[PDB]
Structures are given as structure tokens and as C-alpha cells.
């Protein structure tokens, strides 16, 4: 017989398919005894388990025939309505998705072809890179700094290339924590409007602001200006339950129709029980829930910064968050994050090495830390161990 | 300002993105008053809504932290073990997917490139066609007949073409209802083994057999032979709940790894609550449940044939199912199924015109009828109305 060799049987796509270190690391971090600063896993004590149990049961008893049946792709109507009210659009402009990860998959399918340019920050969210990579695009990057993307570098890229879209996370970027301030958002919008460019705005961390208010999204600025080119991505993952896999894409009807049709082939539709459950949980008390979310992450972030300031040598650089889940660390004198990873893990501490957040490589001396999962005690202890680990490595470079 | 034009903004991919008529028809059929022979939607009386409610609440109360949190991509351990035991493999060989529709999308990503040959029947499941078409493949088809795929036709294709895989639904195919007999399964396996080819075997309707026993799957026959090239797809959709979106792929470790990594970029993971709920519902009493689902559909099938034999002119031909959800109809004298659909719709009867089930086109005179949803009375009355529409159109052309 002719042998079957898998490497041979695979299409060219398969070579662009690689594991996510974030996804893989969860197998390690969910194990008892690990102090995790790895994945952006929401604080478990914010899970409304009792309320979820009541809501799920009522949905299934009274609306079982709907929760358990096939449903149209666009989403459970009341959820589309609720998202529409919150974001300030019409329901028919909302698509419910299977996590914002799916929306990333969908936008890559709709806009990217082999060799097509796509613009994102270096570093940016590895899951977006992973999703877009499948299409075989050319990644164009600009540095991400404490004030979001380098707009001068962006202006230079735009003189040379026409990206299929710009993928951005203006509000507490994954992984740097950067917040793009209002003037830069307006400058960005101007650059995109002048060139009629598409922006995919990933707003996973929208509500996790630590300060008095949130900044207007690029989507809200675009809507004010009457510009139709911002595709807006939001998620219930960081505010309620990541495991429910319920999120949304809001877009111009032409773009949304393509995202809908791509979704039909991706999974038919997002599980109906899950969408119903989100809507039942959020339809009353959402602002109050969001206030608590903000406080819980603000306190964790404060504990995180207090411990880093005390335990980490001053030669090591790290960002200070104004929101979201992450601190971004840069190691000096050529230290490897993978080296540090090894040491820390021996001390039961996990983080994410920064390398794979760089779509074109580099960043071997960087790492992302999440303060979302651990309580204050665990944050302090975990950072003490990391600090110990760094000093040992710094001693021996 | 350079104008933004969506048709211009889209990649080549977007041109390959089209609506599924199955998915679109749900918008119509789920409205009150319609007698739907359209999508393969299970009978609502089979939804264990009361039991699902108890199970959901207990999962959320007792294991809420797990149900609501991010989880690794492969799936909930006890569900994978459940599947492993049922199918007869190791849990490490099982990937939990967000419905088998997701598995189809993943298989296209791993195996297909622009211009890559892929083999399926004409007609076949339109969702598979939709998922695969994204990659820009060259579709090769063989007729789907009463014994399943035309193997003489396949034998001819294989002398000239090397498909990336053969997509098959041997057990009550969508849309013809055909059952590939054991000798034919054995022949196909020899054909595949000699050439070292991959088969994607879609077993959505596996358990829905009307006769005394089910036939061995291509997967089972390959496993007996020690052949590693069958990727096996199964789902809880046709036996428990389509709305939960919980299914599985089983494959050789190398193929499975690629499916896992592709799924990471597609949605991270299938929601944990849904996986847990499926396992809790089926861990006891699965055999008995399946006995009842076979009964329900067998009855519906009998009603459907009884009504068609009564109401439909003998110049119209249709399949007689031995399992599954569908009857496949072929109109004479080049009568259009789309014309029939318009007439039938005016009388509140819906079905799926057969055209989109043909990956390279044709089949305009065909249609798929599902007896899954309606009860005996609805089936009889719906077919009465279809017969009247059919008889009307038969007179004009
Ligand atoms: C900016 C951004 N967008 C999208 C996603 C996907 O989230 P959805 O739940 O699908 O809406 C993440 C995931 N953030 C986590 C993922 C953790 C995991 O995959 O285990 C992270 O980056 O650690 C993200 O940071
Ligand atoms: C052979 C086959 N495979 C896979 C699927 C995907 O189902 P999953 O629930 O994701 O496992 C279907 C859907 N059959 C129905 C779908 C109806 C709808 O999309 O509303 C049908 O073909 O009517 C199918 O017929």
C-alpha cells in the first residue's frame, strides 16, 4: 500500500498552524499549587455561580425548546438588543460570537489572503496573530508604547503599504497594558479616514478601567464622524464568564453580512443557552457588576505594582497599568524570558514569555504578567519568587 | 478622504463566502404557522429540558468555577473519556468541538489550499461545502446513490486525481438519506488504503438507524485494519441538543494536533458548561435515550412516506430512508425546486431546495425534506399541501 504520511497529507495551511503558549500554559496553571501570572483568567470570586445556576435552570425549564434547538446565526435577539443598547447601535448591526477569539478568526477569513498586508503592534495579542496567520498574510508592525501605537511609525508604514486592516487594542492593550489617550485616538481616526482604511478594534478590556471614566472607543469616534470603517469587537469574557464563550462583533452591514456567512461555516451559531444566560445575568444590575469588576482588578493591580516595586531590581523595566489585566516586563542585559520562565516554574510560578506576542519575532527579553487570577497574598508571594529568580539570573549573566 | 468600499476592502476569501440556505431558512421556519420540512431540527419533545435544568444548576453550584472559567482546548476530561469509551479509542485521541460544523471548518484549514482537490458526493451536506469552499479548493464529486457513493465513479476519479481527503456521510447521508452497505464500506476502505488517502467520515446520523442494528463505521473498519487515515466526526446534536453545540473529532495524533491548534485560533475552547451538561445528561441511560430517539424518528419517517405515497404524483421520485432525518426528492421535466419552494412557501410549507447541496452546481430539480421537526399531523398536512403545489407546477411545465 501507498503509505500515509501526515506531514505530506497536510495542506500549506497546516504549516501556518502552531500552538498558542497561552492556551498550552493553562494545562499547567490550572493545576493545584501553581501561582499563575500566565493567562488572563478572571478572578474566580467574581463568578456569579448561584445566580448563574438559578438563571440556567429557569431558561431551560421555561425556554428549553429554544435554548436546546438550532438558532439563527446572528444571535439570541434580546442579547443582540442588549449589546446594541450598551454600544449604541441597532441590533441588526450586532453579531453574537463564540468569544471574541472567533471574531478574530472571522475577520481574518473575510479580509486576508496569502501575501496580503495586515498591520498590528509589536507586541500584540498572540491569539489575533494566531488567527490571522492561517491566511498567510504579511504582518506589518509598529511599536506599542505606554501611549499605544507609535503613530509616527504608523504614518511611515501607511506611505508604503495599504493594510487590509489595522488590528488595535486601544484600551489596556494585550500584552503591554498600554492605553491610547484621546488625542492619539483622534489622530489615528484621522489617518484611517483620510485613507479609507479598516480598523478592527478589540475592546476585550473596555470596562476594566481603573480611573474615573473610560475613553471613547475608535468605534465611537468613527460613529460621531460618520465613518463606517471600524469593526468593533467586545466580549463578556473579562466582565462575566470567559468559559461561556459569548462575545460580539459590531460592524457596517456589508462587513457584518460577510462575518455572519463566515460564522455559518465556522460553527453554525453560538450556543443558545449561553447567550440566554448572559442576557439573564446582565439585563439588570450590569453597571453595579461593572463597578465591582473595576474595583477588584484595581486592587489586584495595586498589589501587583506594590510587590514589583519592592521585589524587582531597578534594572528591570515593567509597565504600570491604568486598566485591564497585565503588566509587561522587559529584562535587561540580554536576559532570556524563557530562562526566567524555567527558574520561576521550578518555584511554582507561571508567566507568559513575550516572544510569541511579536508577529515577526524578537522580544525574547520580554514577558507578560497577569494579576487577574491570584488574590493579594498570592500576588505578593508569586512576585517575591519572581524577584528572587531575577536577582539570581542578573547575578550570573 | 479616500472612499471606503467594502467590496474592494474584502479579501479573495470574501468572494468564496456565501449564505447557507439551511441557515437562512431557520429565520422563516421558526416563525409560528410554518410547517417546516427544512432544517434537520430534532423534535422538541425529545429535549430533556427538565433534566437539563437540574443538571445545569447542579454544575453551576458545585463546579461553577470550572464551568465558568477558561479551559484547555481539547475539552472537558470526563466528556473526552465518555467519547473515548463510546467510540473505542483513547481520551487523548478525542477533540471536543463546537458542533461538528466546527470540525468541518478545522479540517478544511488543515487539509485544503487554493486549488487543492477535495472529494465529496454530489449532493452532499451544504455546510461541509461552505466550510471547505473558504479555502478555494477544486471540488471533485461522485454521485450519491442508493448504495451511497458511486464507487465505480470514485475508482475513475482516483486514477486521475489525488484528493486531499474524501468527505463522506455513510450512515444516512445528508441530503439523500443513503446508507452505504457493509460490502461497499469494505470496498471503499480498500480503495483508500491502497492509495494512502484520508477520509473525513461524518457520523452525525449514526445512532438514528431504523433497522435492527447499525453498520460498522469506516473508522471502525479502518481501526480493525490498523489504518490511521480516517478522521471521525460525531455530534450530540441529532441525539440530544443541537443548541448546546457539542461534538467531537477523533483522529491520529498528528492530525489531531493540527485540529487542536486550529481550534485554539477558532474559539479557544468549546464552552465548559455545555460539555459538562452533555456529560451529566448522558453518563447514565444513554443507550435507553438512543432507543427512544430511534423510535421517534422511525415513526416520523413512516408518516412521511405514507403521506408522500398518497399525495405525490408518481412521476416524482423520492428516496425511502432507513435512518436519519431526510427524504430526497427529484422533480421531472426540469421542474425547478426554487419554483416549487415559492408555491409551497405561500401555503406555509418550507423545504430546502437541492441546488446548494451540489458543490459544482446542478440539481435544480431536487429538494431535501426533513421529517425531524413535525409531528404526524403536521407531516400529513404539509405533504398534502406540497402535493397540491407539485401537481399545480407539473401542469404548467
Ligand atoms: C485582546 C483580547 N482579545 C480577545 C481575546 C479572546 O477572548 P475571548 O474570551 O474569546 O473573547 C483575548 C483573550 N485573553 C486571554 C485568553 C486566555 C486563554 O486563552 O486561556 C489572554 O490573553 O490570556 C484578548 O486578550
Ligand atoms: C452531515 C452533517 N454534519 C454536520 C452537521 C453540523 O451539525 P452540528 O450540530 O454542528 O454537529 C450537519 C447539520 N445538519 C442540519 C443543520 C441545520 C441548521 O444549520 O440549522 C441540517 O443539515 O439541516 C449535518 O447534516
Coordinates of N, CA, C and O in Angstrom, one line a residue, chain A residues 50-197:
Chain A
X50 N -24.2 31.2 41.9 CA -25.5 31.0 42.4 C -26.6 31.6 41.5 O -27.5 30.9 41.2
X51 N -26.3 32.8 41.1 CA -27.2 33.5 40.1 C -27.2 32.8 38.8 O -28.3 32.7 38.2
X52 N -26.1 32.3 38.3 CA -26.0 31.6 37.1 C -26.8 30.3 37.1 O -27.5 30.0 36.2
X53 N -26.7 29.6 38.3 CA -27.4 28.3 38.5 C -28.9 28.5 38.4 O -29.6 27.8 37.6
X54 N -29.5 29.5 39.1 CA -30.9 29.9 39.0 C -31.3 30.3 37.6 O -32.4 29.8 37.1
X55 N -30.5 31.0 36.9 CA -30.8 31.6 35.6 C -30.9 30.5 34.6 O -31.8 30.4 33.8
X56 N -29.8 29.6 34.5 CA -29.7 28.5 33.6 C -30.9 27.5 33.7 O -31.5 27.1 32.7
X57 N -31.2 27.2 35.0 CA -32.4 26.3 35.3 C -33.7 26.9 34.8 O -34.5 26.2 34.2
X58 N -33.9 28.2 35.0 CA -35.1 28.8 34.6 C -35.2 28.9 33.0 O -36.2 28.7 32.4
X59 N -34.1 29.2 32.4 CA -34.0 29.3 31.0 C -34.4 27.9 30.4 O -35.3 27.8 29.5
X60 N -33.9 26.8 31.0 CA -34.1 25.5 30.4 C -35.5 25.0 30.7 O -36.1 24.3 29.8
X61 N -36.1 25.3 31.9 CA -37.5 24.9 32.2 C -38.5 25.6 31.3 O -39.3 25.0 30.7
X62 N -38.4 26.9 31.2 CA -39.3 27.8 30.5 C -39.1 27.9 29.0 O -40.0 28.2 28.3
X63 N -37.8 27.9 28.7 CA -37.4 28.2 27.3 C -36.5 27.1 26.7 O -35.7 27.4 25.8
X64 N -36.6 25.9 27.3 CA -35.9 24.7 26.8 C -35.9 24.5 25.3 O -34.9 24.3 24.7
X65 N -37.1 24.6 24.8 CA -37.4 24.4 23.3 C -36.6 25.3 22.4 O -36.4 25.0 21.3
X66 N -36.2 26.5 23.0 CA -35.3 27.5 22.3 C -33.9 27.3 22.7 O -33.0 27.4 21.8
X67 N -33.6 27.2 24.0 CA -32.2 27.1 24.4 C -31.5 25.8 23.8 O -30.3 25.9 23.5
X68 N -32.2 24.8 23.6 CA -31.6 23.5 23.2 C -31.7 23.2 21.6 O -31.2 22.2 21.2
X69 N -32.4 24.1 20.9 CA -32.6 24.0 19.5 C -31.6 24.8 18.7 O -31.0 25.7 19.2
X70 N -31.4 24.4 17.4 CA -30.7 25.2 16.4 C -31.3 26.6 16.4 O -32.5 26.7 16.6
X71 N -30.5 27.6 16.2 CA -31.0 29.0 16.2 C -30.3 29.7 15.0 O -29.3 29.2 14.5
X72 N -30.9 30.8 14.6 CA -30.2 31.6 13.5 C -28.8 32.1 14.0 O -28.5 32.3 15.1
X73 N -27.9 32.2 13.0 CA -26.5 32.5 13.3 C -26.3 33.9 14.0 O -25.3 34.0 14.8
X74 N -27.1 34.9 13.7 CA -26.8 36.2 14.2 C -26.8 36.3 15.7 O -26.1 37.2 16.3
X75 N -27.6 35.5 16.4 CA -27.7 35.5 17.8 C -29.1 35.6 18.5 O -30.1 36.0 17.8
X76 N -29.1 35.3 19.7 CA -30.3 35.4 20.5 C -30.8 36.9 20.5 O -30.0 37.8 20.8
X77 N -32.0 37.2 20.0 CA -32.5 38.5 19.8 C -32.3 39.5 21.0 O -31.8 40.6 20.8
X78 N -32.9 39.1 22.2 CA -32.7 40.0 23.3 C -31.2 40.4 23.6 O -30.9 41.5 24.1
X79 N -30.3 39.4 23.4 CA -28.8 39.7 23.6 C -28.3 40.7 22.6 O -27.6 41.6 23.0
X80 N -28.7 40.5 21.3 CA -28.3 41.5 20.3 C -28.9 42.9 20.6 O -28.2 43.9 20.5
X81 N -30.1 42.9 21.1 CA -30.8 44.2 21.6 C -30.0 44.8 22.7 O -29.8 46.0 22.8
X82 N -29.6 44.0 23.7 CA -28.9 44.5 24.9 C -27.5 45.0 24.5 O -27.2 46.2 24.9
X83 N -26.8 44.3 23.7 CA -25.5 44.7 23.2 C -25.7 46.0 22.4 O -24.9 47.0 22.5
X84 N -26.7 46.1 21.5 CA -27.0 47.3 20.8 C -27.2 48.5 21.7 O -26.8 49.5 21.3
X85 N -28.0 48.3 22.8 CA -28.2 49.4 23.7 C -27.0 49.9 24.4 O -26.7 51.1 24.5
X86 N -26.2 49.0 24.8 CA -24.9 49.3 25.5 C -24.0 50.0 24.6 O -23.4 51.0 25.0
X87 N -23.8 49.5 23.4 CA -22.7 50.0 22.5 C -23.3 51.2 21.7 O -22.5 52.1 21.3
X88 N -24.6 51.3 21.5 CA -25.2 52.4 20.9 C -25.4 52.3 19.3 O -25.0 53.1 18.6
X89 N -25.9 51.1 18.9 CA -26.1 50.8 17.5 C -27.5 50.1 17.4 O -28.2 49.9 18.4
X90 N -27.8 49.7 16.2 CA -29.1 48.9 16.0 C -28.8 47.4 16.2 O -27.6 47.0 15.9
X91 N -29.7 46.6 16.7 CA -29.5 45.2 16.9 C -29.0 44.4 15.6 O -28.2 43.5 15.7
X92 N -29.4 44.9 14.4 CA -29.1 44.2 13.2 C -27.7 44.4 12.8 O -27.1 43.8 11.9
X93 N -27.0 45.3 13.6 CA -25.6 45.6 13.4 C -24.7 44.8 14.3 O -23.5 44.9 14.3
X94 N -25.3 43.9 15.1 CA -24.6 43.1 16.1 C -24.6 41.6 15.7 O -25.6 41.1 15.4
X95 N -23.4 41.0 15.7 CA -23.3 39.5 15.5 C -22.8 38.9 16.8 O -21.8 39.3 17.4
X96 N -23.6 38.0 17.4 CA -23.1 37.3 18.6 C -22.1 36.2 18.2 O -22.4 35.3 17.4
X97 N -20.9 36.2 18.8 CA -19.9 35.2 18.5 C -19.4 34.4 19.7 O -19.7 34.6 20.9
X98 N -18.7 33.3 19.3 CA -18.2 32.3 20.2 C -16.9 32.7 20.9 O -15.8 32.2 20.6
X99 N -17.0 33.8 21.7 CA -15.8 34.5 22.2 C -15.3 35.5 21.1 O -15.7 35.3 20.0
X100 N -14.6 36.5 21.5 CA -14.0 37.4 20.5 C -12.9 36.8 19.8 O -12.5 37.3 18.7
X101 N -12.4 35.7 20.3 CA -11.5 34.8 19.5 C -12.1 34.4 18.2 O -11.4 34.5 17.1
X102 N -13.3 34.0 18.2 CA -14.0 33.7 16.9 C -14.1 34.9 16.0 O -13.8 34.7 14.8
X103 N -14.4 36.1 16.5 CA -14.5 37.3 15.7 C -13.1 37.5 15.0 O -13.1 37.9 13.8
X104 N -12.0 37.3 15.7 CA -10.7 37.4 15.1 C -10.5 36.4 14.0 O -10.0 36.8 12.9
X105 N -10.9 35.2 14.2 CA -10.9 34.2 13.1 C -11.7 34.7 11.9 O -11.2 34.6 10.7
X106 N -12.9 35.2 12.2 CA -13.8 35.7 11.1 C -13.3 36.8 10.3 O -13.4 36.8 9.1
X107 N -12.7 37.8 11.0 CA -12.2 39.0 10.3 C -11.0 38.5 9.5 O -10.8 39.0 8.4
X108 N -10.1 37.6 10.0 CA -9.0 37.1 9.2 C -9.6 36.4 7.9 O -9.0 36.7 6.8
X109 N -10.6 35.6 8.0 CA -11.2 35.0 6.8 C -11.8 35.9 5.7 O -11.6 35.7 4.5
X110 N -12.4 37.0 6.2 CA -13.1 38.0 5.4 C -12.1 38.9 4.7 O -12.3 39.2 3.5
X111 N -11.0 39.3 5.3 CA -10.1 40.4 4.8 C -8.7 40.0 4.4 O -8.1 40.7 3.6
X112 N -8.2 38.8 4.8 CA -6.9 38.4 4.5 C -6.8 37.2 3.5 O -7.5 36.3 3.5
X113 N -5.8 37.4 2.6 CA -5.4 36.4 1.6 C -3.9 36.1 1.7 O -3.2 36.8 2.4
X114 N -3.4 35.1 1.1 CA -1.9 34.8 1.1 C -1.2 36.0 0.5 O -1.5 36.4 -0.6
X115 N -0.2 36.5 1.3 CA 0.6 37.6 0.9 C 0.0 39.0 1.2 O 0.6 40.0 1.1
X116 N -1.3 39.0 1.7 CA -1.9 40.3 2.0 C -1.4 41.0 3.2 O -1.2 40.3 4.3
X117 N -1.1 42.3 3.2 CA -0.6 43.0 4.4 C -1.6 43.2 5.4 O -2.8 43.5 5.1
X118 N -1.3 43.0 6.7 CA -2.1 43.3 7.8 C -1.3 44.1 8.9 O -0.1 43.7 9.0
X119 N -1.8 45.1 9.5 CA -1.0 45.9 10.4 C -1.4 45.7 11.8 O -2.6 45.7 12.1
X120 N -0.4 45.4 12.7 CA -0.7 45.3 14.1 C 0.5 45.8 14.9 O 1.6 46.1 14.3
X121 N 0.4 45.9 16.2 CA 1.5 46.4 17.0 C 2.5 45.3 17.3 O 2.2 44.1 17.1
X122 N 3.7 45.6 17.6 CA 4.7 44.7 18.1 C 5.1 45.2 19.5 O 5.7 46.2 19.6
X123 N 4.7 44.5 20.5 CA 3.9 43.2 20.6 C 2.3 43.5 20.4 O 1.9 44.7 20.6
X124 N 1.6 42.4 20.2 CA 0.1 42.5 20.2 C -0.4 41.1 20.7 O 0.3 40.2 21.0
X125 N -1.7 40.9 20.6 CA -2.4 39.8 21.3 C -2.1 38.5 20.4 O -2.4 38.4 19.3
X126 N -1.4 37.5 21.0 CA -0.9 36.3 20.3 C -2.1 35.5 19.6 O -1.9 35.0 18.5
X127 N -3.2 35.5 20.2 CA -4.4 34.9 19.6 C -4.8 35.5 18.3 O -5.3 34.8 17.4
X128 N -4.7 36.8 18.2 CA -5.0 37.5 17.0 C -4.0 37.2 15.9 O -4.4 36.8 14.8
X129 N -2.7 37.2 16.3 CA -1.7 36.8 15.4 C -1.9 35.3 14.9 O -1.9 35.0 13.7
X130 N -2.3 34.4 15.8 CA -2.5 33.0 15.5 C -3.7 32.8 14.5 O -3.6 32.0 13.6
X131 N -4.8 33.6 14.8 CA -6.0 33.6 13.9 C -5.6 34.1 12.5 O -6.0 33.4 11.5
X132 N -4.9 35.2 12.4 CA -4.6 35.9 11.1 C -3.6 35.1 10.4 O -3.7 35.0 9.1
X133 N -2.7 34.4 11.1 CA -1.6 33.6 10.5 C -2.1 32.6 9.5 O -1.5 32.3 8.4
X134 N -3.2 31.9 9.8 CA -3.8 30.9 9.0 C -4.0 31.3 7.5 O -3.9 30.4 6.6
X135 N -4.3 32.6 7.3 CA -4.5 33.1 5.9 C -3.2 33.4 5.2 O -3.2 33.8 4.0
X136 N -2.1 33.3 5.9 CA -0.8 33.6 5.3 C -0.5 35.0 4.9 O 0.2 35.3 3.8
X137 N -0.9 36.0 5.7 CA -0.7 37.4 5.4 C 0.8 37.8 5.7 O 1.5 37.0 6.3
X138 N 1.1 39.0 5.3 CA 2.4 39.6 5.7 C 2.1 40.5 6.9 O 1.2 41.4 6.7
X139 N 2.7 40.3 8.0 CA 2.5 41.1 9.2 C 3.4 42.4 9.1 O 4.6 42.3 8.9
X140 N 2.7 43.5 9.2 CA 3.4 44.8 9.3 C 3.2 45.3 10.7 O 2.0 45.2 11.3
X141 N 4.2 45.8 11.3 CA 4.1 46.1 12.8 C 4.6 47.5 13.1 O 5.3 48.1 12.3
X142 N 4.0 48.1 14.1 CA 4.6 49.3 14.7 C 4.8 49.1 16.2 O 4.0 48.3 16.8
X143 N 5.8 49.7 16.8 CA 5.9 49.6 18.3 C 4.6 50.0 19.1 O 3.9 50.9 18.7
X144 N 4.4 49.2 20.1 CA 3.4 49.6 21.1 C 4.1 50.2 22.3 O 5.0 49.5 22.8
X145 N 3.7 51.4 22.7 CA 4.4 52.1 23.8 C 3.4 52.4 24.9 O 2.2 52.0 24.8
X146 N 3.7 53.1 26.0 CA 2.8 53.4 27.1 C 1.5 54.2 26.6 O 0.4 54.1 27.2
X147 N 1.7 54.9 25.5 CA 0.5 55.6 24.9 C -0.1 55.0 23.7 O -0.7 55.6 22.9
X148 N 0.1 53.6 23.5 CA -0.5 52.9 22.5 C 0.5 52.8 21.3 O 1.7 53.0 21.5
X149 N -0.1 52.7 20.0 CA 0.8 52.5 18.9 C 1.6 53.8 18.6 O 1.1 54.9 18.8
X150 N 2.8 53.6 18.1 CA 3.7 54.7 17.6 C 3.0 55.2 16.3 O 3.2 54.6 15.2
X151 N 2.4 56.4 16.4 CA 1.7 56.9 15.2 C 2.6 57.5 14.2 O 2.3 57.5 13.0
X152 N 3.8 57.9 14.6 CA 4.8 58.3 13.6 C 5.3 57.1 12.8 O 5.5 57.2 11.5
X153 N 5.5 56.0 13.4 CA 5.9 54.8 12.7 C 4.7 54.3 11.8 O 4.9 54.0 10.7
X154 N 3.5 54.4 12.3 CA 2.3 54.1 11.5 C 2.2 54.9 10.3 O 2.0 54.4 9.2
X155 N 2.4 56.2 10.4 CA 2.4 57.1 9.2 C 3.4 56.7 8.2 O 3.1 56.7 7.0
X156 N 4.6 56.2 8.6 CA 5.6 55.7 7.7 C 5.2 54.4 7.0 O 5.4 54.2 5.8
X157 N 4.5 53.5 7.7 CA 4.1 52.3 7.2 C 3.0 52.5 6.1 O 3.0 51.9 5.0
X158 N 2.1 53.5 6.4 CA 0.9 53.8 5.5 C 1.3 54.5 4.2 O 0.6 54.5 3.3
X159 N 2.5 55.1 4.2 CA 3.1 55.7 3.0 C 3.5 54.6 2.0 O 3.6 54.8 0.8
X160 N 3.8 53.4 2.6 CA 4.4 52.3 1.8 C 3.5 51.1 1.5 O 3.6 50.4 0.6
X161 N 2.5 51.0 2.4 CA 1.6 49.8 2.3 C 0.2 50.2 2.6 O 0.0 51.2 3.2
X162 N -0.7 49.4 2.0 CA -2.1 49.6 2.3 C -2.6 48.3 3.1 O -3.1 47.3 2.4
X163 N -2.6 48.3 4.4 CA -3.0 47.2 5.1 C -4.5 46.9 4.9 O -5.3 47.8 4.7
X164 N -4.8 45.6 5.0 CA -6.2 45.1 4.8 C -7.1 45.6 5.9 O -8.2 45.9 5.8
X165 N -6.4 45.6 7.1 CA -7.0 46.3 8.3 C -5.9 46.6 9.3 O -4.7 46.1 9.1
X166 N -6.2 47.4 10.3 CA -5.3 47.7 11.4 C -5.9 47.0 12.6 O -7.1 47.3 12.8
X167 N -5.2 46.1 13.2 CA -5.8 45.5 14.5 C -5.2 46.2 15.7 O -4.0 46.3 15.9
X168 N -6.1 46.7 16.5 CA -5.7 47.5 17.6 C -6.5 47.2 18.9 O -7.6 46.7 18.7
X169 N -5.8 47.5 20.0 CA -6.4 47.2 21.3 C -6.2 48.5 22.2 O -5.3 48.5 23.0
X170 N -6.9 49.6 21.9 CA -6.5 51.0 22.4 C -6.7 51.0 23.9 O -6.0 51.9 24.6
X171 N -7.6 50.2 24.5 CA -7.9 50.2 25.9 C -7.3 49.0 26.7 O -7.9 47.9 26.7
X172 N -6.1 49.3 27.2 CA -5.4 48.3 28.1 C -4.9 47.1 27.3 O -5.3 46.0 27.5
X173 N -4.0 47.5 26.3 CA -3.6 46.5 25.3 C -3.1 45.2 25.9 O -2.4 45.2 26.9
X174 N -3.4 44.1 25.2 CA -2.8 42.8 25.5 C -1.6 42.8 24.5 O -1.8 42.7 23.3
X175 N -0.3 42.7 25.0 CA 0.2 42.4 26.4 C 0.8 43.5 27.2 O 1.1 43.3 28.3
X176 N 0.9 44.7 26.6 CA 1.7 45.8 27.2 C 0.9 46.6 28.3 O 1.5 47.3 29.1
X177 N -0.4 46.5 28.3 CA -1.3 47.3 29.1 C -1.5 48.7 28.6 O -2.3 49.5 29.2
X178 N -0.9 49.1 27.5 CA -1.0 50.4 27.0 C -2.4 51.0 26.9 O -3.3 50.3 26.4
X179 N -2.6 52.3 27.2 CA -3.8 53.0 27.0 C -3.5 54.1 25.9 O -2.7 55.0 26.2
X180 N -4.2 54.0 24.8 CA -4.0 55.0 23.8 C -4.9 56.2 24.3 O -6.1 56.1 24.5
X181 N -4.3 57.4 24.5 CA -5.1 58.5 25.0 C -5.9 59.2 23.9 O -5.7 59.0 22.7
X182 N -6.9 60.0 24.4 CA -7.9 60.6 23.5 C -7.3 61.3 22.2 O -7.7 61.0 21.1
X183 N -6.3 62.2 22.4 CA -5.7 62.9 21.2 C -5.2 61.9 20.2 O -5.3 62.1 19.0
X184 N -4.5 60.9 20.6 CA -3.9 59.9 19.7 C -5.0 59.1 19.0 O -4.9 58.7 17.9
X185 N -6.1 58.8 19.7 CA -7.2 58.1 19.1 C -7.8 59.0 18.0 O -8.2 58.4 16.9
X186 N -7.9 60.3 18.2 CA -8.4 61.2 17.2 C -7.4 61.3 16.0 O -7.9 61.3 14.9
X187 N -6.2 61.3 16.3 CA -5.1 61.4 15.3 C -5.2 60.1 14.4 O -5.1 60.2 13.2
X188 N -5.3 58.9 15.1 CA -5.5 57.6 14.4 C -6.7 57.6 13.5 O -6.6 57.3 12.4
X189 N -7.8 58.1 14.1 CA -9.0 58.1 13.3 C -8.9 58.9 12.0 O -9.3 58.5 10.9
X190 N -8.2 60.1 12.2 CA -7.9 61.0 11.0 C -7.1 60.3 10.0 O -7.4 60.4 8.8
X191 N -6.1 59.6 10.4 CA -5.2 58.8 9.5 C -5.9 57.8 8.7 O -5.7 57.6 7.5
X192 N -6.8 57.1 9.4 CA -7.6 56.0 8.8 C -8.7 56.5 7.9 O -8.9 56.0 6.8
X193 N -9.4 57.6 8.3 CA -10.4 58.2 7.5 C -9.9 58.8 6.2 O -10.5 58.6 5.1
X194 N -8.7 59.5 6.3 CA -8.1 60.0 5.0 C -7.7 59.0 4.0 O -7.6 59.3 2.8
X195 N -7.5 57.7 4.4 CA -7.0 56.7 3.6 C -8.1 55.6 3.3 O -7.8 54.7 2.6
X196 N -9.3 55.8 4.0 CA -10.4 54.9 3.9 C -9.9 53.5 4.3 O -10.2 52.5 3.5
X197 N -9.3 53.4 5.4 CA -8.7 52.1 5.9 C -9.7 51.5 6.9 O -10.5 52.2 7.5

